């Protein structure tokens, strides 16, 4: 269940931001569900490339291909080598 994701870790990531001072209780909760949605959509889009290469193992290059192709993942472009 999404409720199982650790809110303390989400808050820690949030607190890396240089302009974050205080965080509401509900912000990490929202990010937990958003993380599930995001992982699911990114994985499904990477899996297109897995199957297009006649493979059954999702590989890091499949994720990189999904990042470069889809506008919703533009923000990940600096992760791609």
């Amino acid at each position: 269940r999404v409720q199982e994701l650790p809110l303390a870790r989400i808050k820690k990531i949030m607190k890396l931001d240089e302009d974050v001072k205080m965080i509401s209780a509900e912000a990490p909760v929202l990010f937990a569900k958003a993380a599930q949605i995001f992982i699911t959509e990114l994985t499904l889009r990477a899996w297109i490339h897995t199957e297009d290469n006649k493979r059954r193992t999702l590989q890091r290059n499949d994720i990189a291909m999904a990042i470069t192709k889809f506008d919703q993942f533009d923000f990940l472009i600096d992760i791609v080598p």
């Binding site: 949030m14 993380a35 999702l58």
Partner: protein, 87 residues
């Protein structure tokens, strides 16, 4: 700094066919991507709060940042999740 790999892997495995497999470095890659997602959205919300001279990142700030940055489809499921969360 990262969500637990077991949780990331479970969500990933639920997304693909039951016979599919996921390489270890692909799970780690998605782990990195989802911390970047949180940081990216947070940066948008935090600059807005700073411009408005507010000290607390609220839930509306996160949702609005998602809407601004191309994740508007997340807003409705997130509101339902949070409302059932606090019910």
């Amino acid at each position: 700094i990262y969500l637990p790999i077991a949780n990331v892997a479970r969500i990933m495995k639920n997304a693909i066919p039951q016979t599919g497999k996921i390489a270890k470095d692909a799970k780690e890659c998605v782990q990195e991507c989802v911390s970047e997602f949180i940081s990216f959205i947070t940066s948008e919300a935090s600059e807005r709060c700073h411009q408005e001279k507010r000290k607390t990142i609220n839930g509306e700030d996160i949702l609005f940042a998602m809407s601004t940055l191309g994740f508007d489809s997340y807003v409705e499921p997130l509101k339902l999740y949070l409302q059932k969360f606090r019910e």
